Structures are given as C-alpha cells and as structure tokens.
Design a protein around this ligand. Structure first.
Ligand SMILES: Nc1ncnc2c1ncn2[C@@H]1O[C@H](CO)[C@@H](O)[C@H]1O
Ligand SMILES: Nc1ncnc2c1ncn2[C@@H]1O[C@H](CO)[C@@H](O)[C@H]1O
Ligand SMILES: [Cl-]
Length: 330
C-alpha cells in the first residue's frame, strides 16, 4: 500500500560545523555525546556563526523516513508526524519534506520556535547539542491511524519520550492490535534509556524490533537487569503466537549483532560483518544510525531477510559516513 512506513519524531533543524576542541570545553561538551542544551549551553546557537556552519533538516526519525521515501519513490510512501514551531524555520523544514514527496501532517505549536540541533564536528566524531523547542508539544492527533492507514511498519525513536511517553505508547499499542503490523523503536541515546526507564519498559513489551548501538544497549542492560551478544540477548527478554521479536545492535565498524526469538522460543543470532571503509575515506559519523535504520526499514517493507535487511542498512550508513554529516542521494 502507498504508505509503507509511518513514524513520529522530533522535526529539528541541523546546524553543522567543524569546531576545535577548545569549543567543546567552553560549552562543557563531551566529544561523541548527545544531549539536551542547558541554559549555559544556549549560547552555542549564536557563537556557531564564527565557524561558517551549514544548515539542513535534522531529526533522527525524519532522516530515517526520509531514506525510506527516497528508496520507495512513490509519494506518501512514508508518512511522518511531529511538531514544528509557527516560525519561518518550521516553514522551511515543512517545505523540504513536501518537495521530497513524504506524507506528513505537522502539528504547529503557536509561539514556539522550531527545534534546533548543534551538530559539532571534531575529529571525525559528532557531538549533538539540542534545543527541542516546539518538539515538546507533540501530541498525536485524534485521526493519526486514518492518516497512516495501511502502514504495516510503525517507527518511533526514544527521543520522542521527552515530550510524552504517550505518543509512542499510543502508536505502539495500535500496531500491536493490527495483525501483520510491527512496531519498531530506536534507543536514540544513553540518556533516553537512562531517563525513560518505566515508560521504556511498557513500550518494549510492544516492540517487535529494537534498534540501538553498543553504547545505548550497555546503558539499557545495566538499568534494567541483564547488565555485545549477551547484552543483545539480554534485551530480548524485555520485549518478550510468535510476533517478530528482534533486536539489532550496531557496533561501529564491528559486526552487527542481531538476535531474534522464533515462534518456538528458538533463539537465532546473526553477526553481520561490516564492509571495511578506510579511515581516511570516513568523513563523519553523524546520521550513521539513522541511515542504518532507514536502509533496514526499506528492505524490511521489501520482505528481504534480517541479514539482508542488515546489509541494506550497512550500505546506507556507509554511503553517509563518506559524506559530511547526513546526505540524501545514493
Ligand atoms: N533530542 C533529539 N530528538 C530527536 N532527534 C535528535 C535529538 N538530538 C539530536 N537529534 C537528531 O539526531 C540526528 C543524528 O542522528 C541529527 O539529525 C539531529 O537532528
Ligand atoms: N568506523 C566505522 N567503519 C565502518 N563502518 C562504520 C564505522 N562506524 C560506523 N559505521 C557504520 O555505521 C553503522 C552505525 O554505526 C555501522 O553499522 C556501520 O555500518
Ligand atoms: Cl527520487
């Protein structure tokens, strides 16, 4: 059907820039980290101009559904919901999506500024500093299921829990009632895993596919019980007819580890190898995961196998890290 994937997320505007470490320390930031801007960190948004920053659509899930749409081609092949501000920024972000053919229904938070992310590039590492703004006002509308009518793949990032666990919870609870419908979620960041414990727990029980990276899965493991492969197999209990129960754990250049529980409690795990990419060819790792999940969901809606799904993602991620931040044409 037209709409293959449906996702909710935080539509934010990205401000990219290569900055010196001295910058990281002045704005009390840890290289590689991802966090919400503090009051003393609100200054970065301005002071960035002295670094000829670049600007473009951001938002984890937005990027993912974006990869989907591009590969699916048809308009509204991927639908998306979220909240932008009633400012010029949100208009630009919205115009961009439409130009892509993405089906979207954005909610506007009057008097609020669209969210912005300071993507700090130092070394090859990416440092994310965000100010959600309007994003925190996201509320899933009374007719969402009608808008995303026919989609069998529903996606949501943990980043969305900051506004309210309700959104994902709601979306998650809908797909679960739909036979053949699957719910997928991303750990987004250590902090999500760390702050949305209780809610995360309830949503997990409804997740058919869980995505994340070593770092997040590690925090996940510790918080809950369980505390690579073990962490991965550990997480599968939290989710645990036979409706798909898969957990994909990415590990930078190391093999991707995927563990799934079959209808008969049989556990099958796969360690997928990542094709070598010379260090020098690597530009940055910003948007790597998003590119990965995108490839995955694409192949998924295509009926390919997990391993095969893991391969498409690897490809997408690979193309992207060989470009300055997130890029769209493959
Ligand atoms: N709190 C957040 N919620 C949603 N997306 C985020 C968050 N902070 C960073 N991002 C997005 O993560 C992307 C990188 O995966 C960037 O495009 C950035 O816009
Ligand atoms: N150092 C790296 N070398 C090769 N691929 C990488 C590296 N870091 C990240 N990736 C790719 O990005 C994905 C998400 O981190 C990985 O699954 C992998 O495909
Ligand atoms: Cl196209």
């Amino acid at each position: 059907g037209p709409m293959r994937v449906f996702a909710i997320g935080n539509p934010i505007l990205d401000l990219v820039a290569e900055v010196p470490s001295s910058f990281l320390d002045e704005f009390f930031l840890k290289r590689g980290d991802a966090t919400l801007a503090t009051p003393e960190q609100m200054r970065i948004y301005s002071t960035l101009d002295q670094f000829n920053p670049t600007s473009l659509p951001g938002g984890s899930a937005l990027n993912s559904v974006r990869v989907v749409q591009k590969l699916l081609r048809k308009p509204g092949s991927a639908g998306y919901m979220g909240a932008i501000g009633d400012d010029p920024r949100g208009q630009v972000l919205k115009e961009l999506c439409d130009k892509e053919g993405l089906a979207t229904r954005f909610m506007v938070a009057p008097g609020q500024s669209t969210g912005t992310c300071a993507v700090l590039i130092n070394e090859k590492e990416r440092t994310l500093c965000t100010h959600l703004g309007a994003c925190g006002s996201f509320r899933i509308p009374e007719n969402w299921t009608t808008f995303a009518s026919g989609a069998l793949i529903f996606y949501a990032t943990a980043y969305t829990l900051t506004a309210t666990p309700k959104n994902a919870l709601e979306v998650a609870g809908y797909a679960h009632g739909i036979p053949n419908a699957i719910f997928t979620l991303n750990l987004s960041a250590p902090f999500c895993v760390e702050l949305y414990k209780d809610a995360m727990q309830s949503l997990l029980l409804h997740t058919n596919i869980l995505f994340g990276n070593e770092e997040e899965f590690a925090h996940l493991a510790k918080v809950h019980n369980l505390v690579k492969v073990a962490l991965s197999v550990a997480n599968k209990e939290h989710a645990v007819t036979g409706a798909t129960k898969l957990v994909v754990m990415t590990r930078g250049h190391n093999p991707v580890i995927a563990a799934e529980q079959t209808a008969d409690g049989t556990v099958v795990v796969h360690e997928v190898g990542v094709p070598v990419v010379a260090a020098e060819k690597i530009v940055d790792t910003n948007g790597a995961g998003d590119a990965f999940v995108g490839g995955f969901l694409y192949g998924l809606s295509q009926g390919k196998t997990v391993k095969q799904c893991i391969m498409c993602g690897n490809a997408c991620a690979q193309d992207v890290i060989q470009h300055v931040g997130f890029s769209l044409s493959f």
